[PDB]
Curated annotation (Swiss-Prot), chain A:
Role according to the record: Binds to WASL/N-WASP and suppresses its translocation from the nucleus to the cytoplasm, thereby inhibiting its cytoplasmic function. Plays a role in the regulation of cell morphology and cytoskeletal organization. Required in the control of cell shape and migration. May play a role in cytokinesis. May be involved in pre-mRNA splicing.
UniProt subunit comment: Interacts with the N-terminus of HTT. Interacts with the phosphorylated C-terminal domain of POLR2A. Interacts with AKAP8L, SF1, SRPK1, ENAH, ATBF1 and MECP2. Interacts through the WW domains with formin proline-rich regions and with WASL/N-WASP.
Top-rank taxon, per record: Eukaryota
Post-translational modification Phosphoserine, affected residues: 8
UniProt organism field: Homo sapiens (Human)
Domain comment in the entry: The WW domains are essential for localization to nuclear speckles.
Domain WW: 3-30
Localization: Nucleus speckle; Nucleus matrix
Family the UniProt entry places it in: Belongs to the PRPF40 family.
Full protein name: Pre-mRNA-processing factor 40 homolog A
């Protein structure tokens, strides 16, 4: 794992892959 | 913590 749990400007939460430069609204636990 | 990454599309 190399993602980063961030917070959207709306009030939600989105992760960001700091290894592949990606993003998602769910916790990347693959 | 202003600077932040883009949003997932």
């Amino acid at each position: 794992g190399s993602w980063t749990e961030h917070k959207s400007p709306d009030g939600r939460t989105y992760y960001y892959n700091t290894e592949t430069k990606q993003s998602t609204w769910e916790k990347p636990d693959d | 913590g202003s600077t932040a990454p883009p949003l997932p599309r």
